[PDB]
């Protein structure tokens, strides 16, 4: 359900993901896109290369700033229809949910249920 999985074929994504994971082993490639029916600002950038030791809660704060939100505005991440805990690191979230193209896909919205 990701636009990046349509503009890039599966083989081109896997080749880039394998090479990126090989070049930068302490970093993980992440794709972030807005939910189709979300009423919040959009992201000018969707391909991210984030450090493994970066916590999911810290990645919340970066994505929050990139769409110009405050601490009171709602924002939720969805990885395979699961909200990850803010205490887990991006390296742990990647090892558990990265697709066969070696990319971690994350969808964001202002609702706890993106549907």
């Amino acid at each position: 359900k990701f636009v990046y999985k349509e503009e890039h074929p599966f083989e081109k994504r896997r080749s880039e993901g394998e090479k990126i994971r090989k070049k930068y082993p302490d970093r993980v490639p992440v794709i972030v896109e807005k939910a189709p029916k979300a009423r919040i600002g959009d992201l000018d950038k969707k391909k991210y290369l984030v450090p493994s030791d970066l916590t999911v809660g810290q990645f919340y704060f970066l994505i929050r700033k990139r769409i110009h939100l405050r601490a009171e505005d709602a924002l939720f991440f969805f990885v395979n229809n699961v909200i990850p805990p803010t205490s887990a690191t991006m390296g742990q979230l990647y090892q558990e949910h990265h697709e066969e193209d070696f990319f971690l896909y994350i969808a964001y919205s202002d609702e706890s249920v993106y549907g």
Binding site: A74, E111, S112, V113
Partner: protein, 176 residues
């Protein structure tokens, strides 16, 4: 009627809550944590609480008790149901155990595990009010087509009547 059919304003939420507490004294108002008090609601009437609601079977008896809450969601302008459960030994149920009391239709669709907006952790289950206004709007118009009228006071009574499908074994009060 209402200011906007389907949703509810903070004053309509108090009016509907005051009628629920009157009709079903097992529900009561509450304030919650001081730092999480909302200014558009009376400090004494922030959300509704009912405690030790029996749950005899899942979705000899292994009876479980539930604390249920009804908070106001300014985003959707609808109520929002919250629930937290205990076993027979008064011990807090794990997340996977509370899902034994949530019907299969809503376990992954309309139920989340978030912090109560007025209380400290541990997080609790919550029926998401994403579709509530659309359903309550259809109900209000149906009782009007039937010759009756769904007053502001009985909004939460009808709301509790229909969310029962999400938790059909948690026996909270909303009648008699």
């Amino acid at each position: 009627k209402f200011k906007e059919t389907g949703v509810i304003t903070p004053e309509e939420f108090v009016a509907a809550g005051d009628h629920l507490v009157h009709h079903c004294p097992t529900w009561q108002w509450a304030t919650g944590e001081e730092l999480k008090v909302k200014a558009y609601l009376p400090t004494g009437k922030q959300f509704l609480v009912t405690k030790n609601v029996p749950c005899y079977k899942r979705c000899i008896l292994q009876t479980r008790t539930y604390d249920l809450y009804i908070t106001y969601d300014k985003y959707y302008q609808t109520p929002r149901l919250w629930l937290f459960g205990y076993d027979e030994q008064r011990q807090p149920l794990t997340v996977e155990h509370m899902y034994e009391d949530i019907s299969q239709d809503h376990v992954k669709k309309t139920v989340t595990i978030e912090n109560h907006p007025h209380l400290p952790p541990p997080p609790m289950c919550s029926v998401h009010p994403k579709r509530h206004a659309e359903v309550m709007k259809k109900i209000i118009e149906t009782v009007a087509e039937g010759g009756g009228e769904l007053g502001v006071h009985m909004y939460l009574l009808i709301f509790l009547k229909f969310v029962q499908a999400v938790i059909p074994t948690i026996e909270y009060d909303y009648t008699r």
